[PDB]
Amino acid sequence: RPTFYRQELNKTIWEVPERYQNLSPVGSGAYGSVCAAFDTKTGLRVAVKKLSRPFQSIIHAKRTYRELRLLKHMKHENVIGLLDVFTPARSLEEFNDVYLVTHLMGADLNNIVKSQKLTDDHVQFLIYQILRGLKYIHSADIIHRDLKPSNLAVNEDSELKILDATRWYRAPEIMLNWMHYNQTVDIWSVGCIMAELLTGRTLFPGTDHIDQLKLILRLVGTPGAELLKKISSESARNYIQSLTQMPKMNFANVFIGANPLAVDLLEKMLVLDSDKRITAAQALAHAYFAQYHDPDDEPVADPYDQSFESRDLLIDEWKSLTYDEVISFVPPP
Ligand SMILES: COc1cc(SC)ccc1C(=O)N1CCC(Cc2ccccc2)CC1
C-alpha cells in the first residue's frame, strides 16, 4: 500500500498515492472532479477523477459500480479506460472514495477543431478513430447514446478516445422517443460530427427540440413507407404524418466540394431508418478510410456482462461489489 498524501484543489480534498504528483484541476468541472497529474511511475500525464459521493445511496453506489465495471472492461486505443483505480481506504468499512486514473488527453474535439473545416485527410483520421472505438464499444453490446464533441477526448495530435447544444448530435429516433433503438444511434452522431468537421458548421443546430427534428427531417426526408410500417404507435404515426412532409435531399448538393466518398459515407450514416444505417464495422471498411483501415487492427471487446443492471441490491452490497473491483484491478502493461 503506497504512501498517500492530501491536497485541496477547488475546495475538494484529494487523497492520492504519492505516485501521482503535480495535481491541477482540468475540464472546469465539465467531467466531474478531475485533476491532471504527473504519474511518476510512467512519466506520463494522467487524469485522475474523484468520484462524487459514491456510496451515499443505492443509486449512487450502483452508478459507481457501473462506471468502474465499464471502465475496467474498456481496453482499446480509442476508448477511455483505466490506468489505475485506488482508494485511500484500507478496508471495506473505511471504503468511501473511489479514484480513477486514465491517460490525460487534455481537450475535447471542439477545443482541437475550433469549428474550422479540416482537410479531408484530417477528417478521415478523426472519424476513423471514432468508428474504431465505436466498433469496440458496440461489440461489448454497449451503446454510447450521447456521442458528441465534448465526449471525445482528443490531444493536439488529434489522437482520440471516446469518453463513456447538447442535442445537436442525437439520433432522430431518440428525439422522437421511439422505444426501440439500436447501436447505430451512435453512428448518427458520428455522421453529424463528420459533417461538421468537413464543413465547419454544425449540421443540425436546432434552437429547441422541435426545431432540431425539423432540421433533421429536411435533410433526411420524412419517413418512407417502409419505415412507417415499423412504427407501432398510431399516435406516433399520426404525429409523424402531422409534420411537414419533405423528400430527402441529395447529400452531394449539401456537402458541396467534399470528397465524394465522404458524401457517400454520410449518406449511409445519416439514414433516417436506423435499421438501414451503416454499422461501425461496416463504416470502417468503407473506401473513405482506405488509408487507415486495417481489418486486423480494429479489435473487438470481450463479452461484457451487464446483468447487474437488472438487480436491486442494498447499498452495502453495491459498495462491496465495487470494493471487489477495486481490489481485483490489474493495470495495463
Ligand atoms: C474530453 O476530454 C477532456 C477534455 C478537456 S477540456 C474540454 C480536458 C481533459 C480531457 C481529458 O483528457 N479527459 C480524460 C479523462 C476524463 C476523466 C476520467 C478520469 C479517469 C478515468 C476516467 C475518466 C475527462 C476528460
UniProtKB/Swiss-Prot annotation:
Q: What is its main location?
A: cytoplasm
Q: Where found in the cell?
A: Cytoplasm; Nucleus
InterPro entries hit by this protein: Kinase-like_dom_sf, MAP_kinase, MAP_kinase_CS, MAPK14, MAPK_p38-like, Prot_kinase_dom, Protein_kinase_ATP_BS
Provide any one GO MF term from the record.
protein phosphatase binding
| Active site (record annotation) | D164 (proton acceptor)
State the needed cofactors, names only. Mg(2+)
Q: Name one GO cellular component term.
A: secretory granule lumen
The protein's PTM annotation reads: Dual phosphorylation can also be mediated by TAB1-mediated autophosphorylation. TCR engagement in T-cells also leads to Tyr-304 phosphorylation by ZAP70. Dephosphorylated and inactivated by DUPS1, DUSP10 and DUSP16. PPM1D also mediates dephosphorylation and inactivation of MAPK14.
Query: What residues does ATP bind to?
Result: V26, G27, S28, G29, A30, Y31, G32, S33, V34, K49
Q: Name the reported effect of F308S.
A: Emulation of the active state. Increase in activity
Q: Give residue numbers for the modification (Phosphotyrosine).
A: Y304
- Altering F308L: what's the impact? Emulation of the active state. Increase in activity
Identify the residues that the record assigns to the Protein kinase domain, covering every copy. 20-289
Substitution effect: A47V: In a gastric adenocarcinoma sample; somatic mutation
Impact of altering A30V?
Answer: Lowered kinase activity
| One family name in Pfam for this protein | Pkinase
Q: Which reaction does it catalyse?
A: L-seryl-[protein] + ATP = O-phospho-L-seryl-[protein] + ADP + H(+); L-threonyl-[protein] + ATP = O-phospho-L-threonyl-[protein] + ADP + H(+)
* Activity: how regulated: Activated by cell stresses such as DNA damage, heat shock, osmotic shock, anisomycin and sodium arsenite, as well as pro-inflammatory stimuli such as bacterial lipopolysaccharide (LPS) and interleukin-1.
Q: Which GO terms describe its biological process?
A: 3'-UTR-mediated mRNA stabilization; angiogenesis; apoptotic process; bone development; cartilage condensation; cell morphogenesis; cell surface receptor protein serine/threonine kinase signaling pathway; cell surface receptor signaling pathway
Its assembly, as annotated, is: Component of a signaling complex containing at least AKAP13, PKN1, MAPK14, ZAK and MAP2K3. Within this complex, AKAP13 interacts directly with PKN1, which in turn recruits MAPK14, MAP2K3 and ZAK. Binds to a kinase interaction motif within the protein tyrosine phosphatase, PTPRR. This interaction retains MAPK14 in the cytoplasm and prevents nuclear accumulation. Interacts with SPAG9 and GADD45A. Interacts with CDC25B, CDC25C, DUSP1, DUSP10, DUSP16, NP60, SUPT20H and TAB1. Interacts with casein kinase II subunits CSNK2A1 and CSNK2B. Interacts with PPM1D.
Give the UniProt family note. Belongs to the protein kinase superfamily. CMGC Ser/Thr protein kinase family. MAP kinase subfamily.
| Biological role stated in the UniProt entry | Serine/threonine kinase which acts as an essential component of the MAP kinase signal transduction pathway. MAPK14 is one of the four p38 MAPKs which play an important role in the cascades of cellular responses evoked by extracellular stimuli such as pro-inflammatory cytokines or physical stress leading to direct activation of transcription factors. Accordingly, p38 MAPKs phosphorylate a broad range of proteins and it has been estimated that they may have approximately 200 to 300 substrates each.
Q: What is this protein called?
A: Mitogen-activated protein kinase 14
* Natural source organism: Homo sapiens (Human)
